[PDB]
Amino acid sequence: DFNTLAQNFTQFYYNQFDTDRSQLGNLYRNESMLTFETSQLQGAKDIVEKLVSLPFQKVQHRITTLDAQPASPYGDVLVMITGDLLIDEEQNPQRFSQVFHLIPDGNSYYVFNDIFRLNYS
Amino acid sequence: LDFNTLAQNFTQFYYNQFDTDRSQLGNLYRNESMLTFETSQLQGAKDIVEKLVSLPFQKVQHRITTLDAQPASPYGDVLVMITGDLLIDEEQNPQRFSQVFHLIPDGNSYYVFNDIFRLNYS
């Protein structure tokens, strides 16, 4: 159910991030907030700017866990993801944790909350 | 921060109770609250607490590595993501985890509406 909906949107999101992150703007809105580790941004413009500023040439997201729950009785969804992030030609991946608060929009969603952290052992 | 501080005030309270006696956490959940613990899905304070209590370990201590929060909507609720370690049975062998809480205001405190928990192998 919510896992399927979250699976579809989340996969679409990461596919776009790994393909061309400069085109992620349409998945965010003016009210959207991104906490990228220690960086705090608001709005599609600043959010995408931060993601594009990441100095890597290639990146691959590898999901290891995905869980979703309705965030309220009104259609919004909370999704938590953990996985591996392969940067450039690096052999050893970096662990990450991310949470999205998705708001219904048309036949899909837009991201209201985006919290991202790389996790170190 | 602001929300990080607000979220921290509550999360510390929550983990303090979890670490002393998790069977007493019911007051922090409600009928509609949902817990997803390693895919196991529970709803309501009774079932949620039963799950936490059923966890196979006597002593447990949470060590927080990162805590990040944001307002979940413009109206007062908070979203917080935590990454940390779980130390059980006084063992010096950390069990890493990631957790997300969707907190709803209640007086000067909050209750947990969404709780998602995952072990995160180190």
The one-letter code for the residue type at A111 is V
Q: B122 with A121: CB under 8 angstroms?
A: yes
For residue B75, report the phi and psi dihedrals to the nearest 5 degrees: -95, 5
Domains within chain B, CATH numbers bracketed = 1-122 (3.10.450.50)
Q: Do A119 and B83 touch (CB under 8 A)?
A: yes
- Find how far residue A104's CA is from the centre of its chain: 16
**Could you give the CA distance from residue B48 to residue B41 in angstroms, rounded to a whole number?**
9
In angstroms, this model's resolution equals 1.6
CA distance A57 to chain B (A): 27
Ranges assigned E (strand) in A11-107:
28-36, 39-42, 59-70, 77-87, 94-105
Yes or no: say if A37 and A116 are a contact pair by the CB < 8 Å rule.
yes
User: How many CB atoms within 10 Å of residue A120?
Assistant: 11
| Span between the terminal Cα atoms of chain B, in Å | 28
Residues in A whose CB is inside 8 Å of some CB of B read: 31, 33, 35, 65, 67, 69-73, 78, 80, 82, 95, 97-99, 101, 112-113, 115, 117, 119-121
Which residue in chain B has the smallest CA separation from A42? B70
B45 in Cβ contact with B31 (< 8 Å): yes
HSE of A3, CA atoms in CB hemisphere, 13 A: 7
Sign of CA dihedral A17, A19, A25, A26: negative
